[PDB]
Amino acid sequence: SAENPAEPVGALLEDFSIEQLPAKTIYALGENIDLTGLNVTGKYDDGKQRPVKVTPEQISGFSSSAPVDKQEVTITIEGKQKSFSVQISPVRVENGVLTEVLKGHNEIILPNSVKSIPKAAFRGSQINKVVLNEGLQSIGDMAFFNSTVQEVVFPTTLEQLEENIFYYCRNLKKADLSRTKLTKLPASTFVYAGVEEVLLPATLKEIGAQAFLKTSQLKTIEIPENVRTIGLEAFRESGITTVKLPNGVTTIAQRAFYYCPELTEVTTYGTVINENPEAMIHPYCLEGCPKLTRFDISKSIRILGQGLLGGNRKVTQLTIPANVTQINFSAFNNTGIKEVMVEGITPPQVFEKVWYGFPDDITVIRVPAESVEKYKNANGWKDFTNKITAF
Numbered sequence: 567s568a569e570n571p572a573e574p575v576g577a578l579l580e581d582f583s584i585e586q587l588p589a590k591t592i593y594a595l596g597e598n599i600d601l602t603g604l605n606v607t608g609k610y611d612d613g614k615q616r617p618v619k620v621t622p623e624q625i626s627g628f629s630s631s632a633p634v635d636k637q638e639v640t641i642t643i644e645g646k647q648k649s650f651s652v653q654i655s656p657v658r659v660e661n662g663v664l665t666e667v668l669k670g671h672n673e674i675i676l677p678n679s680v681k682s683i684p685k686a687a688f689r690g691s692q693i694n695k696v697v698l699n700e701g702l703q704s705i706g707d708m709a710f711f712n713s714t715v716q717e718v719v720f721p722t723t724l725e726q727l728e729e730n731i732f733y734y735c736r737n738l739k740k741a742d743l744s745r746t747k748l749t750k751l752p753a754s755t756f757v758y759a760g761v762e763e764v765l766l767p768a769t770l771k772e773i774g775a776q777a778f779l780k781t782s783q784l785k786t787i788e789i790p791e792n793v794r795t796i797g798l799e800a801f802r803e804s805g806i807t808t809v810k811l812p813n814g815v816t817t818i819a820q821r822a823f824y825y826c827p828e829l830t831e832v833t834t835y836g837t838v839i840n841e842n843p844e845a846m847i848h849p850y851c852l853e854g855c856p857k858l859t860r861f862d863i864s865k866s867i868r869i870l871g872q873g874l875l876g877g878n879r880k881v882t883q884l885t886i887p888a889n890v891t892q893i894n895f896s897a898f899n900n901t902g903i904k905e906v907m908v909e910g911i912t913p914p915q916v917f918e919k920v921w922y923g924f925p926d927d928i929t930v931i932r933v934p935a936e937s938v939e940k941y942k943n944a945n946g947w948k949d950f951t952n953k954i955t956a957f
């Protein structure tokens with residue numbers, strides 16, 4: 567009850583109209599109506615129009631006992647009635663936690679009261695579509711594990727993810743996370759998922775281990791601008807034909823693109839450079855990629871590991887950028903590379919007694935004209951003296 571009189575002295579409402587609906591039009595089972603945001607204009611018998619605050623006993627037809635897709639809620643004042651629609655979703659929310667999802671509903675629209683989705687909340691769900699609500703902050707482990715879900719709409723408030731959420735989501739065609747606040751895409755997020763397209767947010771800094779493992783339908787991937795790290799086997803056995811990644815990438819873990827049978831290009835973009843002496847493309851990163859013809863190295867990488875393109879024969883030209891300071895044993899060995907351009911005025915260092923950094927049948931190594939002798943006298947590089955020339 568309001569402390570002060572609300573109605574005008576001497577004037578009675580004759581009619582009213584809903585000018586703005588309540589902000590909450592989606593409810594969970596057992597939730598109470600929330601009229602916040604409702605704007606009513608009353609026509610009074612003194613000719614003056616006035617805002618009307620609806621008192622609780624004036625509502626009828628609202629009931630959150632059972633799922634209802636469209637429920638008519640009526641406002642009754644001065645024998646006059648106006649109605650609006652609400653949806654009672656087949657879900658239970660207790661202290662902001664999605665505690666229950668009811669079966670037999672192919673489209674789930676979550677209420678705004680959902681703050682977190684717990685572990686396995688939609689696991690094995692035989693549903694088609696989920697609209698995640700604004701206000702959702704986190705999603706728990708295996709939340710959609712082996713769901714038949716075809717579409718998931720993500721909210722701008724989504725901040726935190728646990729692991730294996732879309733593992734075995736064979737029908738999830740697209741995951742548009744581009745408008746979320748995610749800084750990390752966790753390990754095994756899309757293993758065996760049918761994702762054809764995954765749009766990542768500008769806030770993303772890390773891609774977890776096996777995040778896109780066995781994504782056979784993923785056509786391409788654009789790694790967003792602020793990503794620093796690509797985890798162990800992040801794209802192992804993915805169907806990706808091309809990868810775009812920023813020049814700020816400092817870690818590409820082992821076998822990150824292992825056995826991608828349709829991968830043809832790895833290209834870089836951006837002018838942001840992150841300094842870190844540990845920045846490395848880890849061993850056998852693109853082993854088992856027989857269709858790869860182009861491999862751009864992130865301009866923030868310092869170290870090139872063993873067998874980066876192991877067994878490949880279609881990359882015939884390679885550019886090593888000026889930021890590379892170290893090349894390990896057999897880095898580009900077991901390849902079909904014929905032409906390498908090493909851009910560093912200062913040669914990358916080689917510490918092994920037996921290097922095999924490039925194949926025996928390499929044709930030429932092009933280095934800056936002012937550095938030809940620095941390369942020819944250097945450990946490792948001296949093994950290819952008769953193939954070194956200027957650019």
Ligand SMILES: [Cl-]
Nearest residue numbers: 596597598599
């Ligand atoms: Cl409530």
